[PDB]
Amino acid sequence: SAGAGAMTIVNRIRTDVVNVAKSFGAEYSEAVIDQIFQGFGEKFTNTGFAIRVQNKRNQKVDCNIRYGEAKENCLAWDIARESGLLSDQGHPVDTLIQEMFQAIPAIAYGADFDINYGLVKIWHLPKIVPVEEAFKIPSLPKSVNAHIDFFKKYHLDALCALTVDYRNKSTNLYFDAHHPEQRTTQFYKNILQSQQFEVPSDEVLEILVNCPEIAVTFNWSSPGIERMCFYTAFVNRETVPQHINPVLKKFAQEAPALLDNPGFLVGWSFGPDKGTYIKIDVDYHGLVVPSFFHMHNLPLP
Ligand SMILES: CC(C)=CCSP(=O)(O)OP(=O)(O)O
Numbered sequence: 001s002a003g004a005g006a007m008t009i010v011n012r013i014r015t016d017v018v019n020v021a022k023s024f025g026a027e028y029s030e031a032v033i034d035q036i037f038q039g040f041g042e043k044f045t046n047t048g049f050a051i052r053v054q055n056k057r058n059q060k061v062d063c064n065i066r067y068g069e070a071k072e073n074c075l076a077w078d079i080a081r082e083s084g085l086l087s088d089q090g091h092p093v094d095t096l097i098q099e100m101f102q103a104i105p106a107i108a109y110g111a112d113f114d115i116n117y118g119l120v121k122i123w124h125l126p127k128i129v130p131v132e133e134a135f136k137i138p139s140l141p142k143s144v145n146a147h148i149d150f151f152k153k154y155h156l157d158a159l160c161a162l163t164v165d166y167r168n169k170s171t172n173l174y175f176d177a178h179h180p181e182q183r184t185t186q187f188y189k190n191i192l193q194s195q196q197f198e199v200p201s202d203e204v205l206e207i208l209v210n211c212p213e214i215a216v217t218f219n220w221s222s223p224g225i226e227r228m229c230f231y232t233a234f235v236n237r238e239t240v241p242q243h244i245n246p247v248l249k250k251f252a253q254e255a256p257a258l259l260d261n262p263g264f265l266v267g268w269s270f271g272p273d274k275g276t277y278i279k280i281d282v283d284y285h286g287l288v289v290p291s292f293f294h295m296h297n298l299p300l301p
Pocket residue numbers: 112121163165172213215217229231265267279292
């Protein structure tokens with residue numbers, strides 16, 4: 001029963017994470033997994049936890065695990081620091097999450113882990129605030145401020161989260177996609193073509209019009225948007241658009257959850273052409289999807 005029968009919730013989680021990774025051919029490191037769970041296993045059992053797979057072009061599927069909780073302080077940072085998961089790089093990322101929590105009150109935070117790497121991100125979730133609140137933050141890439149006109153033009157006025165990617169050396173600003181123009185396929189064409197990104201099929205455009213959340217990625221090495229992502233939730237296995245892509249089908253049908261019918265969150269990423277790929281998270285305990293609708297002032301579907 002090393003991995004079966006009666007077991008703690010945390011051990012069930014670990015076993016499920018490894019099974020997913022093996023099934024999708026994701027790489028992982030046993031030492032990294034152990035290191036993550038020593039620090040964070042208890043959080044994973046009691047809060048909004050998700051397992052993600054994503055399929056970047058010309059590489060293996062990546063398997064991530066992640067959680068969030070409604071605490072005002074960035075509890076992940078002290079945990080990751082003591083676990084040895086978060087070393088200073090001599091870089092703006094090093095102080096960025098601390099600056100985010102200083103500059104804007106959080107109502108929640110989270111952390112994200114690639115099981116082949118360690119801690120990849122920490123999230124800051126304020127209440128929805130004007131995007132200009134982010135310009136207070138010292139270490140934000142200069143590109144962010146430079147996109148003020150872009151944000152206004154595409155109704156990216158309502159900031160709903162921030163993140164720091166320690167691995168990629170980037171930061172995402174997340175927006176509440178409230179504006180009725182964001183219910184039209186033309187919006188998505190236009191925002192993508194504004195950055196010279198790949199425009200997806202009409203089929204996919206028709207899915208994007210339900211997107212409540214738009215992420216925009218910025219970095220310190222270039223003046224432009226690195227990639228953007230449109231997030232859409234589905235309240236059960238069957239409603240995921242399994243026909244769009246085999247990873248969506250397989251994950252929807254096979255992803256483990258401790259709850260008997262989980263929902264999913266799908267991110268549709270686009271970049272130059274790479275940055276164009278799909279991310280899918282299983283709502284392992286069933287907390288994440290309701291919370292996603294609630295945070296965007298949407299009734300649950
Ligand atoms: C759970 C929600 C609504 C957003 C999470 S941010 P993310 O993991 O998709 O960020 P990246 O893929 O690292 O850009």
